[PDB]
């Protein structure tokens, strides 16, 4: 379906994370689609995982 500019931003951040593998990147993107109410939490965990794989 369609997204607001906040949802689009969240996708963009995860899409660009350099230390995630493609399974993880797509897993997190899927979570953003799954439950929009959890956007902030999902992004937080993706950031943490990205940082730990630096």
């Amino acid at each position: 379906g369609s997204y607001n500019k906040d949802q689009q931003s969240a996708f963009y951040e995860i899409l660009n994370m350099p230390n995630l593998n493609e399974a993880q990147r797509n897993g997190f993107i899927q979570s953003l689609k799954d439950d929009p109410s959890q956007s902030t939490n999902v992004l937080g965990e993706a950031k943490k995982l990205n940082e730990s794989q630096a």
Partner: protein, 221 residues
Amino acid sequence: EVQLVESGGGLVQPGGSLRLSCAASGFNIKDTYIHWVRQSPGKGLEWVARIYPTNGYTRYADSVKGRFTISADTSKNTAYLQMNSLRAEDTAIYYCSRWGGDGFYAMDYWGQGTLVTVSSASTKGPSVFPLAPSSKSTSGGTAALGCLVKDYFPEPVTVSWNSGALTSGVHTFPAVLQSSGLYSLSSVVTVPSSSLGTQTYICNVNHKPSNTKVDKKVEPK
């Protein structure tokens, strides 16, 4: 008849992702809450998440918030759990259940559960060896025989005898983790001594994670 069936469980490395499905039938998930509940091996039940598919309202356990997401597709009468950033402690059987169905304020139906194993270790199929009946496995006119299902990962394995036709007198032991990090178990069955050599005994072993399916005929030496 109300039924829920989970699928999608399997071995994943720490940091990895998996997606579980909960397929409902005999009722519409639009009319109830759907929950995910997990159970670490040998431990208790722990609530994971819940959704009300009619309005999309969700709640999560603190320990999975941000890492797992619950969702539902009412047109497929199916709920899902996306699981990212997985950790060893997430290893569990994951059940889905309904709540509020038919006005019952409890989890009245549960699926069979699907196993999630979070580990860096590789899949390995078992070797299956006979435990042949002999003068050392018989007494009182009955005799024990079986199969040793050795060196596999991850759980689980299933064992049946004679394609499920033989169930009386069977003991399939709980798997034991060896020091190598691989599992092993035996399944034994007790039968009349007089049937040895006339009645065929085969253990049917299945280890789905490695696609291993073995039918081993067990005979006196």
